[PDB]
Amino acid sequence: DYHEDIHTYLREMEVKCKPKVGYMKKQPDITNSMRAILVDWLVEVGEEYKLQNETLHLAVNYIDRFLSSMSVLRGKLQLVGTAAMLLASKFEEIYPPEVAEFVYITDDTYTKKQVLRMEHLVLKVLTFDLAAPTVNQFLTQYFLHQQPANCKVESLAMFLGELSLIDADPYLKYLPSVIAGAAFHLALYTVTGQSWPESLIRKTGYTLESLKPCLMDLHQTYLKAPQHAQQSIREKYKNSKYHGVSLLNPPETLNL
Amino acid sequence: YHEDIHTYLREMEVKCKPKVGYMKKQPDITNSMRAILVDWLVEVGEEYKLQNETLHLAVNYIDRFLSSMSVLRGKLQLVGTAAMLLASKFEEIYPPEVAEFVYITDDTYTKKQVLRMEHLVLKVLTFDLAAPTVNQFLTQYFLHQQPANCKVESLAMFLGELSLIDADPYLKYLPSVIAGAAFHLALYTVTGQSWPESLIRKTGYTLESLKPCLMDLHQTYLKAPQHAQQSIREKYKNSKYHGVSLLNPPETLNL
Amino acid sequence: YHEDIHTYLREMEVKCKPKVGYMKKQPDITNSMRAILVDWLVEVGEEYKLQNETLHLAVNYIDRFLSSMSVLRGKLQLVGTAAMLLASKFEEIYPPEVAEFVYITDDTYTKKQVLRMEHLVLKVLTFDLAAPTVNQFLTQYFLHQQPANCKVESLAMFLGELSLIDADPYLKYLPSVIAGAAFHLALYTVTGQSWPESLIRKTGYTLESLKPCLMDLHQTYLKAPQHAQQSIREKYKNSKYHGVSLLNPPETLNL
Amino acid sequence: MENFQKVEKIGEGTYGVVYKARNKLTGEVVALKKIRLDTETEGVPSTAIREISLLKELNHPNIVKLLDVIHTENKLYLVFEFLHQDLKKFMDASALTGIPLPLIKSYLFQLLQGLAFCHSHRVLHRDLKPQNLLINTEGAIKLADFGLARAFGVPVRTYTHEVVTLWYRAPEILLGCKYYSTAVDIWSLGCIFAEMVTRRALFPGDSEIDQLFRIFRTLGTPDEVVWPGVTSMPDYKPSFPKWARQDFSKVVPPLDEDGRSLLSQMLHYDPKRISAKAALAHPFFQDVTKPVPHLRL
Ligand SMILES: CN1CCN(c2cccc3nc(-c4n[nH]c5cc(-c6ccc(N)cc6)ccc45)[nH]c23)CC1
Structure with missing residues (x-):
């Protein structure tokens, strides 16, 4: 409604x-x-x-x-x-x-x-x-389109979205809705091997093509997270509240 | 007859x-x-x-x-x-x-x-x-009201009377046509309705054919408060005319 | 520049x-x-x-x-x-x-x-x-006069100034468009000429695109002597404006 | 503040006073909400922060306009459009006659339009009560007091504390739900609707348990068929008495068949409760007009 x-x-x-x-x-x-x-x-x-x-x-x-x-x-x-x-x-x-x-x-x-x-x-x-709208708010909205819900996916999406906050370059040039979409897909792909769902494509109008540039950057941030000088978010997301999702190994490629 | x-x-x-x-x-x-x-x-x-x-x-x-x-x-x-x-x-x-x-x-x-x-x-x-007048044609048109509405009749009469003041452009329209435009414009302003099919059959005038006169009349109606001559506006803010001169004109006729 | x-x-x-x-x-x-x-x-x-x-x-x-x-x-x-x-x-x-x-x-x-x-x-x-004004756009347009004509300039300025008086309808036009209509209408009234090709290229406005504003402006021009507000007419009957407010408007624009 | 003439105090609050005031340069009559700033201890109160930031996104004819914020040294003033009185005093003034039904219909219609706009802009009011609803001589009614209002792009967490005076509080809140939803605003409006019709609070509870039980006695004690999940909710007890739902024809006698249907959908137990938008499409409003009230000023 x-x-x-x-x-x-x-x-x-x-x-x-x-x-x-x-x-x-x-x-x-x-x-x-x-x-x-x-x-x-x-x-x-x-x-x-x-x-x-x-x-x-x-x-x-x-x-x-x-x-x-x-x-x-x-x-x-x-x-x-x-x-x-x-x-x-x-x-x-x-x-x-x-x-x-x-x-x-x-x-x-x-x-x-x-x-x-x-x-x-x-x-x-x-x-x-x-x-102000945030990546958090858009993720929350996208989580309602999970068939069915998966807390590991939600925690990883939230982890990636939170990592985007740390680096102005390149994340200042993406809208929250777009960063959210990339974080959701990437988490969804990492945990369950599935992709940006058709229900969200209809809701947001974003294709997997349109998310690709941001996806590219987010995937690269995800791979380099253990080497980043700033570590507070990785530490936060190895807690049981977040299902230790900051220990999940990222895929080496995205197959786009 | x-x-x-x-x-x-x-x-x-x-x-x-x-x-x-x-x-x-x-x-x-x-x-x-x-x-x-x-x-x-x-x-x-x-x-x-x-x-x-x-x-x-x-x-x-x-x-x-x-x-x-x-x-x-x-x-x-x-x-x-x-x-x-x-x-x-x-x-x-x-x-x-x-x-x-x-x-x-x-x-x-x-x-x-x-x-x-x-x-x-x-x-x-x-x-x-x-001589035939806008008044006489309005009166004949009022008999094709489904049903009668005194606020429409008063506003139609108000607009028709305003047409008397300005030789340019109203000298170049027939009273029957001025009457038709005044009726439609009043009807549209009060009730949102348009020049009825019964009057189309009676007069042979379409809303297309009234359009030139209608656009002038609408323009006169919009500028009435700024006109140097004000006796008609003053007259039609009386109770006998339901204060129709204080009604707001339509911003568009959507023709 | x-x-x-x-x-x-x-x-x-x-x-x-x-x-x-x-x-x-x-x-x-x-x-x-x-x-x-x-x-x-x-x-x-x-x-x-x-x-x-x-x-x-x-x-x-x-x-x-x-x-x-x-x-x-x-x-x-x-x-x-x-x-x-x-x-x-x-x-x-x-x-x-x-x-x-x-x-x-x-x-x-x-x-x-x-x-x-x-x-x-x-x-x-x-x-x-x-803020940009009708005045500033008129001034820029006047540089595309082949050749200059002070009676046209004065009448253009007169019409542009009249547009300031009536919020309805002139609030819904850009100064550049009001200026364009005022220039054409003055040019047409004094010399019989139309919105020139040089200004079409400069502004991108055709005579078609100016038409809505032009028809309002023409209507204001025709009714100027009847308007309750008269300070602009009085001002423009001065010698400094070549008495342009006493000029007769065109009965038709032939658009 | 130099261009404002204080006319009179019209309202007292927790963080400050509301004055009727006049712009000396324009003549505009306004409501000025003064907030004294304790500049050692706390700074700008959370109420002002939410109220200002949310209200300036909410331009609608049925939501009181915030006109300006004069933020200075040690004072914060909110400048609002001025209305003539609140719905509570109007209800009290109308005790020996009731508010006529066409005006009730008008008021509910406008309140729903205000609420629909809030909700479409992800704002929860959370404090809809008659004294927070402002009326004028022309027949307008508007939502006011957004101090407790909240943005819900992320779900809004329930408090232990502070909230919706007891009488307009929704069952899920009383039963200790974790998150607010837009249903809580619709519930309150249902209660206000009934109160206008009957000239009495629908559920005037003396306490939380007493508030719940008054709702149960009127609407019936909810079970898993009526409200899937009730029995698992934090403050639900199996020891709760099981009352039967009574006829709406006896709860709100003056209402017709359409009015009863709308109210029952607004007081639905499962927060299946009608939306503001869906309520606006209800046949109850298929002849709504905009009468003017007799405000005894
Ligand atoms: C308890 N009542 C309330 C009504 N009071 C009252 C009486 C008579 C005239 C009144 N005018 C107001 C008023 N106009 N505009 C307002 C805006 C807010 C506002 C404040 C905060 C927000 N967020 C939005 C609007 C509060 C109150 C008012 N309130 C009046 C009498 C005492």
Whole structure:
């Protein structure tokens, strides 16, 4: 009834919530590597405080949009992320960690006042537009088209989608809906040997052809995951809650 | 005999035509001045509680008179006064006495002048006073309402009366055609319905054939609040006309 | 760079669009009230010898402001005053001081109010004041005259200025299109010629594509003497505009 | 805030007050919700964050417009369109006569259109009660107070705490379901519909168990045939009394055959409960008009 309308609406809103793909080049003091470290650290903080995966995804979306129009010095990058996680928790969590907790995780590198002032600044810069579509939301929507449900597939899809958050190059240039579609297919193929189903092709209008470029990148990220400098997500997804899916070996080829 | 009468009215409306381009051939007066005159005649009709038909007849008389007679701007109102007097005598059960018509002109003209102009207009029109009007055709069309709707009738009459004000473009349409456009446009505005098949059969006019007049009428309707002459709008915001001049026009006719 | 600029103006006119239907969503004010305001701004421009561009900019600012802000009838003139002040600062070499704008409002508003409204309009328009206008497009078109004709230029400007008065229908046309129709109609009226091939190539607009706007503009032109608002006609009967508002419109465009 | 004249307090809340106000430059009458910012302890409240961010995506004639957000030093103001009173006070004013049925039909129709729009935009209101529903003299009704509202592109988790005053709370919530669905908003609207018709709360429970039992007594104690899964739900007890479903003709006497059918579909136990969109297509609304209320101001 309404999950068609909601998917449609999410497809409309994800085109509007886009950050600038090339923002990191126009940024004098910070780099993709530094962003990678920040996002990896946000994964830890989410595990430390038992935060929803959606909160992580929202926070990253907020950071990329903030950095798309604001120059930040390396010593303030973490303050942006903290404020972003704080705002994402307030939006998404039933009860978010208090502000003092967010000051805590930064090892007193920033003050309560700084964090609260950065919260105001990020709200201004984002113009209170916090309800951004994420890879998480599209995956959730796609999981309803599983014949039948498979928790190992869902956990691996979520693992790959979460890995996409770490590397701005190349994942900033793909829509959440597309990254979701690639993560779903890749997980589905790895666990059950099946492919992007015809029901999802009708729902999303994406073919396996159209997902190929993103699929290519995601497969390569999946193969290199054990060598990546950032490891918090692999560690997170070797837990029993996620069926240890970060230990599943990726296929060496995709046969497209 | 209602068929015989429509048929006869259709015959006579082609013969009572004034010259469409007479105002160009007229040295001292303009369409704007005519607009002012007709608007004033609407007020006079409201002041003396005259029938709508009397207004329509008077304007027909004025256009035919001006089609063959040059008139100076200072005498245009004397022509209208005499025309309204003659139309009242023809159409009203008891017309206002001549002194009444002299007084609405603020003593700009004398009783003798008005009575002499009456004679001149009768001569120039050759006593042919029983002219068909938009009013008469609307009245005949209203008998093909399934069922009657007083708000439609009032708005049709409002639009038909607005057509009297602007010689350009309405002098080049027959009363039967203006009536047809006014009926459709009012019907469409109030009830969303269109020129009915019963009237298509009676009149032979399609919605295609009414289109040119309809587009002008629609444009007049949209611009009515901005028109310099406002006596008709004011008249039709009364309860007797269900305040139809305050209704919003359609943005499109979807023809 | 005259090509680069036309191209850039064509890009920006699509972005500076107000909401076409904003007046419906507006509780206390109407198109008629807007017509009165714009007509008054024409007088103010004549009183203070302001450029035509300043008038066009001010109206653009007012429509965009009213597209996102509800205003009561008693504050509509304060919006226009602040808009005219801002347009003068943007466009005039030396604008009238703020006290001057307070005085043309007959002390209905205070200096503080006008200065506060200036701030509010800047906020609501996000300092985006360099809007494309009919005036700017006409000026660019005038460079494709073979050869120049000041009577055509004046009449084109007259028609373009008339389009500012009536939100319905002119809010739904781009300035480039209104400009194109005004140029053709003026050119046709004075010299009998039509929208030239050089401008067809430059603008990509055919005479077919201009037709809807052209028919509205022609209709506005024909009814100009009857319009309740007359400041533009009065302005364009001056010698500086070769009395072009007294020229007779074409009875037909023969399209 | 310099261009706003405070007219009067019209509402008191947890994070702040609501004032009737006037734009001094435009004359626009507005509702200003003031939020005091404790800038040591908490920052911008979660209620404001959700309310602002979700409401600015929701432009609809049956949802109260957020006009502006004036965010400054130590104050946050939300500027809304001004309406004339809430449905609760209107119901109280209409006690010796009822709201006429055509106005009830109109109000439900508009509330469903507002709700359908929310749901199509993945927003759950979660707090539909008569005092959160605003009316004007022209016959409009709109959804207000989106402080508890939530985006559900990801399913929204149930609380232990804080929620929907007891009387409009849906059975699944009372029986401790894990996730909200859009059905909870439809349930509340059903209760409000019945209340307008009968002039009394449908299920005025003194407590959670008392609230459940009042629902059971009217609608019947649900079983696995009526609601597949009930008996496995966290707060379900086999010791629950087994009441029979009674006639809707006695629960809502003034309603016709179509009205009863719509209400029963809105109060369906299994969250098979009618959608807002499906409810709008119900034959109950095949003659809906837009009457104007007698607001005793
Ligand atoms: C408890 N009641 C409520 C109605 N109160 C009231 C009485 C009389 C006139 C009133 N006008 C309002 C009002 N207009 N617009 C509003 C918007 C919100 C809003 C606030 C938050 C959100 N998210 C959306 C809209 C709340 C209240 C109002 N409320 C009024 C009396 C006390």
